[PDB]
Structures are given as C-alpha cells and as structure tokens.
Design a protein around this nucleic acid. Structure first.
Ligand SMILES: [Mg+2]
Ligand SMILES: [Mg+2]
Ligand SMILES: [Mg+2]
Ligand SMILES: [Mg+2]
Ligand SMILES: [Mg+2]
Ligand SMILES: [Mg+2]
Ligand SMILES: [Mg+2]
Ligand SMILES: [Mg+2]
Ligand SMILES: [Mg+2]
Ligand SMILES: [Mg+2]
Ligand SMILES: [Mg+2]
Ligand SMILES: [Mg+2]
Ligand SMILES: [Mg+2]
Ligand SMILES: [Mg+2]
Ligand code: NA
Lengths: 271, 77, 100, 149
RNA sequence: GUUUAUUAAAAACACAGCACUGUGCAAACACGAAAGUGGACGUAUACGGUGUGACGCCUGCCCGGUGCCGGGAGGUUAAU
C-alpha cells in the first residue's frame, strides 16, 4: 500500500512509500539472474552521452520472459518478486513441464494463479496470445510491435494499451500516450494492465533517494556560464533567451520526431 | 572505405566556395550503394559496394567481366 | 440454483452453427446439474433496428435452472464469442415452458 | 536497356523482341531470371542466330508438364486438418506453405509460390477456393476444406 | 549535502517536490566522417531537455513583438 513516513527527521518527513507485502522477502530466483554493471551514462568512447546518471545501488538483471512464446503449456505463478530494473514487479512462474520463468506481473496476478500462452489460451489477465484471438476493446499489456519480437509497449508499471480497431492484417492500439498505432495482428500481447499501479505515488522524500536510484544532480542551464550552456551568464538571474537544450536545439515545444519510415503506422499522435 | 569496387571512386576533397568566395575544405563522396548482382555463370548473387557509375559500367560490360577485373586486381566479394 | 431465462441473437451467417451452439451450452449447463426447461430456437427474425450494420438476426430463447458460476461462464462465452449478438440473461424464479 | 527477350512478358515482350526497358527493371527482374538478356551485339548473335528456335522448343518442354494442370482435379479437395476451435474461426492461418505441402502429394514435390488466394490465408473451418499458377497462363481453381484438430 | 585545491562556503549550486515540453522504440537526445555505443538489456507510471525549488495559501490580465505549434488557399521563391 501507499505508506506515508512519519516526519521524525527532515528527509524522512516528505517520504511516501509503496510497501507491497506480497513481494518475495528473500533472494530472487538464481538461474534467471545475470550481472548488470552500471554505465555512468558513458558510451563506447568513455564520454558522457546522457547526463545525470551514475552511482546508485548494485542490481542484478532478471531475465524476464518478454516474448511469452511457450504456447499451450500452462503455468502457475509461483512467486511475486521485486525487480530493480523495472518500475513494475516481476512474477516467477512454473510451467507444468518444470521450467521456471520470470514474467511481468499484471494487475490481477497473485501467487498460485494459472496463466498460459498460445493461440488457444483463455482471456484471463496474464495470458499471452496474438492480437487476433484477443477481442477488440480489451485491455492488454506487454504488446509486441513485430511478431516474435518480444514485446515493447505497455510494460511499465500500471500501464496498458487498448485495442481500438482491427482492420485485416493490422490492429489499431491506443497507447499509454494517447497515440493510435497500427501493429500487425500477429504480434502478441499479454492481457490486463501491468501491476504495481501505485508505483507513481512514491515521492522519494529526499535527495539521497534519487541519488541511490542512480540520478546525479541536474544543474540548471542558467546556473552556468555562457561557455557551458546556451543559457548562462547574466549578473544575477538573467535569462532573456529562448529555452534550448544544452546543444542549442529548442526545447519547451519543438517536435523532434523525424522517422519517415514508421509514419505509416501512426494513425494519430500524442495529445 | 567509401570506395567503389568497380570504378574505384574513393572520396575526394575540394572547397565549399561561398558567394563571398570563402573556401572551406569539403569532401565529394561517391554515390555508393551495396547492390546484389546476379551472376548467371556462377548462378548466385554477389554483393558489391558500387557507385551508380559502377552499376552503369557493370551494365554496359558484363558482371563476369567486372568480376574478372576485381579478381585480377585483388578484390574480394 | 436459480431459474434464469436467456434470449440471445446470433449472426445470420453462423445460423448453421446455432445447433452446435445450443447443444454445447445446454451440455455445459447439464454438466453442473443445471436443468434446461425451454429451448425455443426462434429462427431468423428480422430486427427492428440494425445492430452492427445488420438486420435479421437469429434468436434463441432458453429457460434454464443453473447455478451462478454456470450462468456467469455462459455470459463470458456469449461475450467472447463473435457471433453471439445481444445476449440477455434474466431471472425468472419459476418454470416457464408454455409458448413464444 | 536494349534487351532481347526470351519469354512472353506480360505487357512488354513477345519472345524475341529487342525492346527498350528501364535499366532497373531489366537489372532486378528480367536478367536475374531467364526472362531476358542484353541485346548489344554478342547476345544478339547468340539468340537471334544460334538458339532463337532451340530456346523455343526448350520453352515448349517447360510449358509441358505445366500445361499439365492435372492437380486442379488431382483427385479432388485436398483437405487440411488444423488445430481449430469451435465456432469455426480457426485461430492461426493455414499458410500457403501448408497448402502446398498438403496438396502436391505429400509436401516435397513442388515449390510454395504457385499458391494464389482471394481470401488472404485462412479465417474459417470450411470451404475455400484457392488458385494455382504453375505457369503464367493457368486457370487453376483447387478446392480446399478445413478440418478441426 | 556541494562549491571558487591556494584571499569569497554564502542568500550561490544541488535537492525531494511542481510544471511545460520532446520522445511509440532502429525512441527522442548525446559521442562518433561511419560502424557502432550510451539512453536501456529501459518502453510513456519510461527516458531526455528546460524553468521553479520542501510544505501551506495561491500563481491574476496581455499572443501586439520574438520563439514554438498547426494551416495551406493565395503572393514571392532555388536547383532542374
Ligand atoms: Mg537529466
Ligand atoms: Mg529536477
Ligand atoms: Mg537543478
Ligand atoms: Mg555562475
Ligand atoms: Mg554559446
Ligand atoms: Mg560579480
Ligand atoms: Mg539584475
Ligand atoms: Mg579558497
Ligand atoms: Mg573542498
Ligand atoms: Mg575560506
Ligand atoms: Mg532558483
Ligand atoms: Mg503568470
Ligand atoms: Mg498572433
Ligand atoms: Mg510555420
Ligand atoms: Na506570439
């Protein structure tokens, strides 16, 4: 639940926590983990390419079955678990053949639930099946944008995509951004919304929270010198400039999508 | 490199003369494309990085002739 | 186990599938000791307003006495089935096998 | 290109024409197949002198065993049993590959690209009419039934 | 908490929080003649940029100028 910490000290006063008492209070499943070394934002060349990244807690990568391409075989949700890589929680499931796999945990997924995947599966939340066998209007998540690809839409916490239309080879999807996108109807989609839908209610309380989540401080452009940023200079809080990114490009409204090869799919764009 | 395999068009340099005649060194690059040519004598596709002029030369001559020049010079494909 | 009354229309091209529909549903009802009372397959009726760019649906009335989980799974089948159009379950608390 | 043709091309050939096609057309569709050759001088000699008439009989041998429809009424109604659900509406399609590998005799006798469909791939457990083209001029109307598995 | 190592430790920077905006993934954006890499083995409850800076009460009018967004009729307009 959403728990507000008592103001027994500053930096603990303003905290709000999401205690999920169903998460596994133990070590995660071992064979499905692999090491995940931090980057710092630095690319192949060693240079910071994306700023404000570094530090934070160690975290191992949980191999999540995004594809859900084990058709027909049922599965029982053995365990719910905390994933440090996602905003949503993961769910270790056990198939009737003896294979354990991490999946994304939908909204209604508690321990022992019976899920599956394939063209003949049911329409219970957690069941993956291509978006032809799925009825239109239903709420899905972990949507694939290409058949067999792996699933890339609506896989954050509390997120879902909605099936609006269905025209022959393709399906129109209202995405979580209000954009209507056409993906071919062979692409898979797990049913139901993603779990941990209250994740957005944490408020982190203090600076060290973001720091150990891995977010280095953000220096305002105005707090710099004219050599450092397009903003800057000024004998005390002078701006007089149009807001831009540190590399000159306009911000605060300037459409920067230029793909021209996926525009055939975007029926209509974000609100 | 941006070098054509038939014609050998590597990139060259020149100036970007402005209306005020300001010379700034620029590069002319060949119209390179990776094209897949059918070889009937070998009955298979050979991919080359050829310019459009390279394609026109291959189409004026034969693909076997151009591959012969490649092989005699020391090219691979 | 309460007495329901189920009127459902179906696409007038799976009208050939209405037999298998009916026996499938009544078998599912009898499996949980549900008792079918009326099974009036009304044939292809002409609609008063066009439902989904389509007049002239195919009606089936069936009066059953079955438990709630049976009737709810039945409603889910009606929903997730593409040919079933405008199902309507209702409570009737009696045994009505007379006419219409 | 000035291209000399070795086959009746749907709109631009007569099996011997020296027609002027677009260079990309001749480069990517005709010459990669055996449908045409460059008509400069040497291939003109070769075709128009050497085998302008021998290639005609080779093309007639090719048009034989093709003009052999003999499978639009093979026996009849090559019927495919796929894992379909109730209410028809078979979940996954029965592809053209499956059609071919069920219709020839037992799969590995023909290719895949002979199968033409006015319905797409498959959406119903029932009666469908598929076309074939073993030659560019083939009125093939094979009939397919779908069975649940 | 940080800062002018070596005359300035501050009311300056950062901050949790807020908002606007871009980004549908081969994401935007950045480094890179390119390959590629970071973003992220993340997927709009995510990520980048910008401004403000807990919290409480609030944030009023102006789109004339500059910018950005949308329009595309018409005027003008390059190579060809
Ligand atoms: Mg940042
Ligand atoms: Mg901030
Ligand atoms: Mg800041
Ligand atoms: Mg300063
Ligand atoms: Mg500057
Ligand atoms: Mg000063
Ligand atoms: Mg001042
Ligand atoms: Mg000092
Ligand atoms: Mg110091
Ligand atoms: Mg001092
Ligand atoms: Mg400030
Ligand atoms: Mg104001
Ligand atoms: Mg105005
Ligand atoms: Mg404009
Ligand atoms: Na304005």
């Amino acid at each position: 639940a959403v728990v507000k910490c008592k103001p027994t000290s500053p930096g603990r006063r303003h905290v709000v926590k999401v205690v999920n008492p169903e998460l596994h209070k133990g070590k995660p499943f071992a064979p499905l983990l692999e090491k995940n070394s931090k980057s710092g934002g630095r690319n192949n060349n060693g240079r910071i390419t994306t700023r404000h990244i570094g530090g934070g807690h160690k975290q191992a990568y949980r191999i999540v079955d995004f594809k859900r391409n084990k058709d027909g075989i049922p599965a029982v949700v053995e365990r719910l678990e905390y994933d440090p890589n996602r905003s949503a929680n993961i769910a270790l499931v056990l198939y009737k053949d003896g294979e354990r796999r991490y999946i994304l945990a939908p909204k209604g997924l508690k321990a022992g639930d019976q899920i599956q995947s394939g063209v003949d599966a049911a329409i219970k939340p957690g069941n993956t099946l291509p978006m032809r066998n799925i009825p239109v209007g239903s709420t899905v998540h972990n949507v694939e944008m290409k058949p067999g690809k792996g699933g890339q839409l609506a896989r954050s916490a509390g997120t879902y995509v909605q099936i609006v239309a269905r025209d022959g080879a393709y399906v129109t999807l209202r995405l979580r951004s209000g954009e209507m996108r056409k993906v071919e109807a062979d692409c898979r989609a797990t049913l139901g919304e993603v779990g941990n839908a209250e994740h957005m209610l944490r408020v982190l309380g203090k600076a060290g929270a973001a720091r150990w989540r891995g977010v280095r401080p953000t220096v305002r452009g105005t707090a710099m010198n004219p050599v450092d940023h397009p903003h800057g200079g000024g004998e005390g809080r002078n701006f007089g400039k149009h807001p831009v990114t540190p590399w000159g490009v306009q911000t605060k409204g300037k459409k920067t999508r230029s793909n021209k090869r996926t525009d055939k799919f975007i029926v209509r764009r974000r609100s | 490199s941006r070098v054509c395999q038939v014609t050998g068009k590597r990139p060259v340099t020149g100036n970007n003369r402005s209306h005020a005649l300001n010379a700034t060194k620029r590069r002319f690059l060949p119209n390179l494309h990776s094209h897949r040519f059918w070889v009937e004598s070998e009955k298979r596709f050979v991919t080359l990085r050829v310019s459009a002029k390279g394609m026109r030369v291959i189409d004026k001559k034969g693909i076997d002739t151009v591959l012969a020049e490649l092989r005699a010079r020391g090219e691979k494909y | 186990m309460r007495h329901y009354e189920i009127v459902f229309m179906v696409h007038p091209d799976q009208s050939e599938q209405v037999p298998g529909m009916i026996e499938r549903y009544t078998a599912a009802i009898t499996g949980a000791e549900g008792k079918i009372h009326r099974l009036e397959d009304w044939g292809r009726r002409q609609l008063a307003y066009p439902i989904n760019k389509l007049h002239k649906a195919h009606y089936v009335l069936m009066n059953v006495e079955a438990p709630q989980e049976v009737i709810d799974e039945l409603e889910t089948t009606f929903r997730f089935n593409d040919a079933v159009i405008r199902s309507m379950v209702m409570r009737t608390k009696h045994a009505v096998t007379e006419a219409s | 290109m000035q291209v000399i043709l070795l086959d009746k091309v749907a709109n631009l050939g007569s099996l011997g024409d020296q027609v002027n096609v677009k260079a990309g057309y001749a480069r990517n569709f005709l010459v990669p197949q055996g449908k045409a050759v460059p008509a400069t001088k040497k291939n003109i000699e070769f075709f128009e002198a050497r085998r302008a008439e021998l290639e005609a009989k080779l093309a007639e041998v090719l048009a034989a065993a093709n003009a052999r429809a003999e499978k639009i009424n093979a026996l009849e109604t090559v019927t495919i049993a796929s894992k379909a659900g109730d209410e028809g509406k078979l979940f996954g399609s029965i592809g053209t590959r499956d059609i071919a590998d069920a219709v020839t005799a037992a799969g590995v006798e023909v290719a895949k690209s002979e199968v033409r469909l006015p319905n797409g791939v498959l959406r119903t457990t029932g009666e469908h009419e598929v076309s074939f083209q073993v030659h560019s001029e083939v009125f093939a109307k094979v009939i397919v039934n779908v069975v649940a598995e």
